[PDB]
With several copies, the nearest count.
Chain A
């Protein structure tokens, strides 16, 4: 149950169900991009295939020429050569009837990418397989990476 999510579930695959109430706009992310030194004119190619799905951008641009002067932050992204993938943010809420009587239903921010984007519409009742995770805005914000969307039978 969405209310039963616990710190013991962090970074573990969790099975849970709810209702999709909002689907954010597709945001394009980087999976392979070509960069250049403004001084060295030194081409390079960074790959971010390893979980380009956290909310924050992790594998960042280098601040010095490869193997290391070059000058801090000399890298510019060559956009016509990079390759991109899309990311979409969903927000899940507990089933409205299965909630404490006078308490706002608990909603949890969720993220998906690649072929799982544009798979649901708001109001659909879905079952989620994904990695319970932690995002820093001492406290932390929980969220779920999407691994699979078991979309139930919905309105035709």
Chain B
């Protein structure tokens, strides 16, 4: 059974979106994943028969016949490995990829270089258990507000493999901490790891990094130091594995970076938290009239191009597949 809810885009304002129960049978099972738009056809069947409403009322269930995602992007074929080698043979390919990183954004080439480094990552290694070395590169984006750190992280989510998005505080489906919670409707225990555990072989984007809870901070420290979150609740004594590269965005104290202070006074994170990072790029706001002019031109062009009534970089799909093959 798949519960279908109307897409929020087409819902008129002020109305509660409605849910209809779609029934999948035979080989139709597990052809969709939650959070993905679908286009399904089938019989609008009247479900079997509660006296809750008093009046005689039957539930409705839509039996399914054919479901197509509106839309394996990481699949491979010999011709595209030939292509990968061909583009790899080019000169300036590093700069081409960097210019390809976050195409929606303008400026801060250091940030693009750092995020590309994090995506490609170092070589995992394990010397027969004698010595273990992290094979990931962690990037921290400590920048002043309104510098598109959030949008950069959203782009990374779009363009990464095994990528999870977590927040320092608020509401999220991933809590950065291992937990044992029981669903009241079904009444059974589930062992859910944090975003760190979920991104076992990928990246974990942690926005609002400065605004973490104490438990979240401790779990972040554990994951970054030993690459293995341990859980000891409700009788479950085990150490889950989380070997993840962390791309984090944090805000300097006071909503602005003070240059005369060192990194210690600018961010509330303590030194052991920062030391495990590799690329600590501070996105300081720069007051240049010409840079602001070029930024405003970019922003205005993008904003006008989006109006419903008025209207060297590598393509994104190639970037996807080439990054995956490079890592693999």
Contacts and interface: CB of A to CB of B under 8 A. Distances in A.
Nearest to B27: A6
A21 B189 contact: yes
Nearest to A4: B30
A88 interface: no
Contacts of A124: 238
B35 A102 contact: yes
B239 A155 contact: yes
A19 B238 contact: yes
Interface string A86-118: 000001010011111111110100000000000
A125 interface: yes
**Chain A interface extent, by class:** 20 to 34
Contact of B238 (A3, A91, A125): A125
Interface of A is mostly: loop
Nearest to B183: A104
A123 B237 contact: yes
A98 B237 contact: no
Interface string B187-206: 01111110001101100000
B242 interface: yes
Contact of B33 (A19, A98, A100, A104): A100
Given A103-B33, A124-B238, 17 more contacts: A21-B180, A21-B191, A91-B189, A97-B242, A100-B33, A100-B34, A101-B174, A101-B198, A102-B34, A107-B188, A107-B190, A121-B237, A122-B234, A122-B235, A122-B238, A123-B236, A123-B238
Interface of A: 3, 19, 21-23, 91, 93, 96-105, 107, 121-125, 154-155
